[PDB]
Amino acid sequence: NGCFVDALNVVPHVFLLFITFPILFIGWGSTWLHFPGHNLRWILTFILLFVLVCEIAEGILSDHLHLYMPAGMAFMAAITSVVYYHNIETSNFPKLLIALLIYWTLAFITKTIKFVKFYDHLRFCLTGLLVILYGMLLLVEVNVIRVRRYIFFKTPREVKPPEDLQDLGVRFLQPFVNLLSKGTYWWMNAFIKTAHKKPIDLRAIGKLPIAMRALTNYQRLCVAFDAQARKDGARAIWRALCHAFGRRLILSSTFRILADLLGFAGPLCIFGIVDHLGKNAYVLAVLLFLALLLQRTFLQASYYVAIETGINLRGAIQTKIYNKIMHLSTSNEMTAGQICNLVAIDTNQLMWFFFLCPNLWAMPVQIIVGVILLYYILGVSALIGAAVIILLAPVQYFVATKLSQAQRSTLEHSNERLKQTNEMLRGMKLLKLYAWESIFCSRVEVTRRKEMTSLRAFAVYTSISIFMNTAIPIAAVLITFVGHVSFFLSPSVAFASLSLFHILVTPLFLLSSVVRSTVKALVSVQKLSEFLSS
Amino acid sequence: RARFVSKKGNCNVAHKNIREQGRFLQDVFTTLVDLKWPHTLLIFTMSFLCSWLLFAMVWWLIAFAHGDLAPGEGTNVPCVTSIHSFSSAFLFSIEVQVTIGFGGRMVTEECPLAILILIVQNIVGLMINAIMLGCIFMKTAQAHRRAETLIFSKHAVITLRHGRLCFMLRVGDLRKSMIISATIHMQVVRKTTSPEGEVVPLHQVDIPMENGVGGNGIFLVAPLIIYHVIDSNSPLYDLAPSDLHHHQDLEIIVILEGVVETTGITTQARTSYLADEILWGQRFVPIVAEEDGRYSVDYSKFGNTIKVPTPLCTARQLDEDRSLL
Amino acid sequence: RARFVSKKGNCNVAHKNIREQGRFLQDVFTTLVDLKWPHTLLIFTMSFLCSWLLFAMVWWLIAFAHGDLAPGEGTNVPCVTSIHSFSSAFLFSIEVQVTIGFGGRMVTEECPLAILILIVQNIVGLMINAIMLGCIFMKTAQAHRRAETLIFSKHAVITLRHGRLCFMLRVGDLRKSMIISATIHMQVVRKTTSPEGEVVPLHQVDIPMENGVGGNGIFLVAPLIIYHVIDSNSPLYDLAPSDLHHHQDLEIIVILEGVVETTGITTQARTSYLADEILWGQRFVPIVAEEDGRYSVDYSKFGNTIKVPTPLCTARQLDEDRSLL
Amino acid sequence: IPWRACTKYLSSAGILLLSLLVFSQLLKHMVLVAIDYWLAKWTDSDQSVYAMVFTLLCSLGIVLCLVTSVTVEWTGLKVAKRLHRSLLNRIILAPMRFFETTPLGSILNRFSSDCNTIDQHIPSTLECLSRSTLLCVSALTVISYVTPVFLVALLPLAVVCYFIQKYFRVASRDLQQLDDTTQLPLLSHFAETVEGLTTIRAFRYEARFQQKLLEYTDSNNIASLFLTAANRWLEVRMEYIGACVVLIAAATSISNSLHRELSAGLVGLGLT
């Protein structure tokens, strides 16, 4: 009785979609309360979305409406569960939660019946995954009733919605929104729309949450520094920062590596589609859509978490070196300029290096996966190509260094020019009282030519950089395809190689800047340690 | 500048940081009886269609499960005679739910499970019909529209009556139907600083309406100018006539309450007059006129105003001059 | 210690030895319209099922008695065509009662007794349907939930305003919908002994709410601190500031009444403040703030309080010092 | 900023190099698309002649790229030269009362930075903007040619981007300047503490000054944080649309170019 069990599955989705509509229509016609398992709930709901897409794929492969309707109904049921949970996060209730719990139990029952009747005789894996996900969501609901007040004894002892991010006027609410918007930044729609009309200012801007201030980051950093110095330096301050900023950085890094994996994965499903049509493809197309959106979302969340950790670190070490400025001795002009450079360039170097920290961990796995993937698509010839592109990464670095050198020289000349100007724009009446102005303008132009001369070499190096940027992509395909067929090709192979070439060219440039930033940050932290410990 | 309550009678102050404990939905039907008509009609049709589709699905399933859905001649009688597909099942659901009872498809005495589904279908249908009638009727006692028909003059003037400064404002009715026992609560708001150093952002204070021996309420047949006399005890008594037009921030609101005749509900109307809306030293034009055998009221001159040669000075200084004259 | 009425607004005093003369049930529907929703829904389904089963039994019996129940071909026509067993009879009862009218089983013009049973079945059905709709609608005018949405600050403070001792308490609204003509009845209770040797266990006395020229009522848009001034005539005027926090037993309750707009019913809210809840010499933080073009109200500071350097002394001794200063 | 500033900037270069830059860029992008267009016909299977044509296209691409880069370099340097000389000459012939009226900071500052800023960043950023816009136009034209119908589906979404553009800039500029402001009094404050350090440690005013510095660093962080939040917003939304377009392109390619079109060399270019 397969159709019978299909209908029995369709029923509970219908029940929930029908109870959701009155409440959703009343709610559709400023305190955020969060419950334990919220993030777990949303993660599991996205996994449900994915498995439901797979079930729809199965239903397309089989076709019999009644045989693939259960997926199309669970889709709206999960979306309506999301709508319910949004309506509960916005206003708490003990009853709406039970309304979810009933549906979870009934869906679990139907899935169990499906599993048994299948065991007695692709479907197997999908049904099992759905069973596991529904069970985990059930356990989450049981946790929620165990926490505060589903039925439990009389009073919830309810939390008292968090005043950190919800009390008196604050505008940057990142930690206090729905875990979907924590990814897609939906809370910025209101800000940006209001910003279009009225000019933004510090009165129109928010105030930083208690999760990120000078005091909070300074507290964590000084606690780590204390726990490290009680066990007694450059390595000490380093490990102190490391243990102080902890989980956020590694979380960003793992977001980043998973995104890198899915990005390396995209072109392979492209390849599969191209193969299938030349000789099971709609599924690959929708999977490509899903993988693209998920990969890019994870990449962006990674960027943001890293940036926020870096901003925390900048605030922390800034207020710390200001705290040190109070206890220093008078015997230690040049030190003042060194101090203000220690805040204007050294701290910015530290913070931008902390921006680029997860990229330094995620780059090697990216190039490794790239080379191993292209080898299995083009064979030995691939290896040759895989060399050429990689050879651009060290060369780039060299080029960059030359730029820096040039920059230094140019800056020198520029400074001198400014001096020869500051006089003329002060002795104005003196200058024009006898018209010696052209005589000084000749000298000013004499300086300018030297400045121009430096700029030629700088722009030549810039030109070489821009040239290599788009030359190596062409050269890779040239020396690879000519060196593969006519030396040693379905459209899929060539186009997958093209995609991988671009997906590998994009990260390669960043490794050079990462290396420069890392060495400069190491030097700047040695400097900060020498200063902070005088 | 910011206004307290708008001219139309709606409230301006936007609320922030409401610790919602859920009472906003806990008022389940006293919430939606507030709504507009399109939303309430939408949610009523959605209630009805939701219930109908739910039971149509369960009936489709029960006819499928008994096996009466499998087309076969003999050896059975369907629990519901003449049922073939989902469509006819949904037709049966709407046939029994909303109590039309077509009877082309007959539920039979062979299956007691169908008896149970019917005996719950009908009671839930009747309960949701009962609430969806009571709440729409509780709605049609929305008489705020009768709060719309009342009107006040756009700006209010002050004058000198009986040797004392006075302020005059108009009101009036717009239909034949009277409003029972209307009362006037006339209030003034101002950012005030106490002698104790306490500053309030807004300070409501009652200014009396001056009728016979006492009384808070009035009788509305024709447009009646409401007549208060500011005295040294009154809170408004201290201001100056040249500082009101531009700078000062003084909202004078009036709240007229009263129960309409036919529905019996108690409605009210609220309006504000700003420091830039009010003006000084004028007089309204007489509306009522002895016509052929009755009193004709002309609403064209309702907001009309004539100049009057009255002295212009502050009520404090005017009281000091009354002490001098 | 024992409280008079609880914070939630429910009454605490448990009644004992009520000479029940039966009026508790004599209010038959004004009793059950008070009940919760599950109990009222239970008793409504039980009313309906009771009536349906009663008439299904009587119909089963009448078809049995006529002999039309005895399956036979010819020499008769059943009073109700196509009736076989009790199940089909109960199906006929629910078919004619709740006015679906399936018509598979036809009541015929051969037996006038069946005509009588139908002509009483339908009228009793219609009457019990009429009451079971009117009472559920009379229920959906439960607006006590709107008595839930109102809020008062947890504790009340006293201050010195205009050179005289004052007590300040907050109130406020939680929805867009206004409350018409709300009035404040502010009462104090205390175990009192008269000079005649009479001791009362509890003694309610009105303490005035101090508005403009008079008036018992207020206007609620934004959170308005209610402002009373205790004077030598006031009953609360005699207490001491150090004896209130721990020992004395003084409940100050406030009862705010008002009719909600949309339903028109008159609701109220009641709250108590104990001698241990109230505190001395403080000031609330200003809620209302001039935002972009409006007034923003922040309910986070609703219950917030700041210290104020005010003299601490008894109102009697403070009045004596005012006589001295 | 209007087109007049850029018009004067490029007219200082002259008609000699303007077209030499623009047409060379157009031709480089045309070669970069045509190589893949010919590879599309290369795929299905004269393989040797095909590979030789591929080699010819690959050589044309790199030669043209080198030419374009050298053009941008030479033009930028000439423009900087002429602009500096003209600025100096025009400042020389000014009346004395003009020099006395205008503060020294503004007159000196333009030469100090404007000149430096332009020389350091205008050529590279201009080259990058040109390459980006032409690559985007080329990609749109490719996915249009590959799918006759996909074109008609992509013009709606692109119009969406227009609405995403305005709302971004009118804020992204604003926040930007705010950042600059919160950076200026902070650093200066630091310096004030260093010089008058003895006076501040004497008055025992260390607490209030530490409070002020926490205030300033918070005002800096809120700005530098909202800026990255807005950049993330624009990024994610533009990316969601860039994924919608590839979804629709692949969905049209699998059916149109296989079922009825019966062409496989198309879907490759479009998907890639």
Ligand SMILES: Nc1ncnc2c1ncn2[C@@H]1O[C@H](COP(=O)(O)OP(=O)(O)OP(O)(O)=S)[C@@H](O)[C@H]1O
């Ligand atoms: N314990 C009680 N509980 C509730 N109601 C009562 C109670 N006692 C009396 N009543 C009613 O309320 C009124 C109070 O009057 P009472 O105290 O009973 O004096 P009474 O003269 O004895 O009147 P009775 O008891 O009816 S003969 C009476 O009229 C009763 O009807």
Ligand SMILES: Nc1ncnc2c1ncn2[C@@H]1O[C@H](COP(=O)(O)OP(=O)(O)OP(O)(O)=S)[C@@H](O)[C@H]1O
């Ligand atoms: N921001 C708010 N919005 C709406 N209602 C509130 C808010 N804060 C409190 N309330 C309710 O109204 C009353 C005001 O008292 P409060 O200012 O909260 O003092 P409280 O002692 O902290 O009481 P709590 O918050 O319930 S422990 C409380 O009893 C709350 O139930």
